[PDB]
């Protein structure tokens, strides 16, 4: 399935592409729809970018405070955080932060900068058993998001799996793990997207994206009162170059799973 009905109407009524996954750690079950069929990630990325550093961090334990310099030449398109630090330093927990929270593009590519670039991240991804997510290019063009393009795409179904690993299995240390869900939680830019669709008790932490043809992405942990951790990855794609972002689309999927 009934859940399936509701999501493939959605996704009709919506008039694009829709791809979902849900584990609910209860019972270990998943909800799954359009799961194995890839989407362009957009910001949603920067997660692994992230986890990556934090990864690296447990061999060099000063890692997060080394500092890297900001320069006119490292501005993209969108850099809310950089942009207050240019001519300066920031350490390596500031830009995880900043990509995290505020998905600051030129955070991101000096996190992708330090672990070697895209192929370092993918690697990174394989080292933990998703064999599907790749990571090609920098910011900002790894956002085009163009049909059929398999740059820069996962599918929801191993997102998802890999989002479980790391925020609630052990793929990083404790402390690691722990500081990857306090950033996720901290998150700014969510309010409208999975979240909205869910109960206002319920804790989430969360990384939207959005990019070319209309895509509107969001990734989250979920704690619900009194139950155990869920897993969410709402993905959303559309016809149109120019299509207008839909995190209404992304917010009636977290309600229809989760009811
Ligand atoms: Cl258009
Ligand atoms: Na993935």
């Known amino acids: 399935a009934d859940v399936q009905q509701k999501l493939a109407?959605?996704?009709?009524?919506?008039?694009?592409?829709?791809?979902?996954?849900?584990?609910?750690?209860?019972?270990?079950?998943?909800?799954?729809?359009?799961?194995?069929?890839?989407?362009?990630?957009?910001?949603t990325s920067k997660v692994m970018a992230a986890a990556a550093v934090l990864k690296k961090s447990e061999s060099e334990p000063n890692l997060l405070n080394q500092r890297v310099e900001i320069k006119k030449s490292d501005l993209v398109n969108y850099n809310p955080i950089a942009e207050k630090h240019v001519n300066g330093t920031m350490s390596l927990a500031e830009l995880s932060a900043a990509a995290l929270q505020y998905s600051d593009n030129?955070?991101?590519?000096?996190?992708?900068?330090?672990?070697?670039?895209?192929?370092?991240?993918?690697?990174?991804?394989?080292?933990?058993?998703?064999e599907t997510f790749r990571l090609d290019r920098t910011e900002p063009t790894l956002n085009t998001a163009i049909p059929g393009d398999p740059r820069d795409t996962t599918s929801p179904?191993?997102?998802?799996?890999?989002?479980?690993?790391?925020?609630?299995?052990?793929?990083?240390?404790?402390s690691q793990r722990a500081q990857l869900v306090t950033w996720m939680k901290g998150n700014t830019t969510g309010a409208a997207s999975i979240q909205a669709g869910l109960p206002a008790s319920w804790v989430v932490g969360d990384k939207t994206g959005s990019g070319g043809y209309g895509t509107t992405n969001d990734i989250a942990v979920i704690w619900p009162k009194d139950r155990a951790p869920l897993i969410l990855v709402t993905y959303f794609t559309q016809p149109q170059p120019k299509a207008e972002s839909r995190r209404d689309?992304?917010?009636?999927?977290?309600?229809?799973v989760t009811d």
């Open 106 to 130: 030129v955070a991101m590519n000096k996190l992708i900068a330090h672990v070697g670039g895209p192929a370092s991240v993918t690697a990174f991804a394989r080292q933990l058993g998703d």
């Open 157 to 174: 179904r191993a997102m998802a799996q890999t989002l479980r690993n790391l925020t609630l299995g052990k793929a990083l240390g404790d």
């Open 249 to 256: 689309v992304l917010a009636s999927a977290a309600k229809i």
């Open 9 to 43: 109407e959605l996704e009709r009524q919506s008039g694009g592409r829709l791809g979902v996954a849900l584990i609910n750690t209860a019972d270990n079950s998943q909800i799954l729809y359009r799961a194995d069929e890839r989407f362009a990630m957009c910001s």
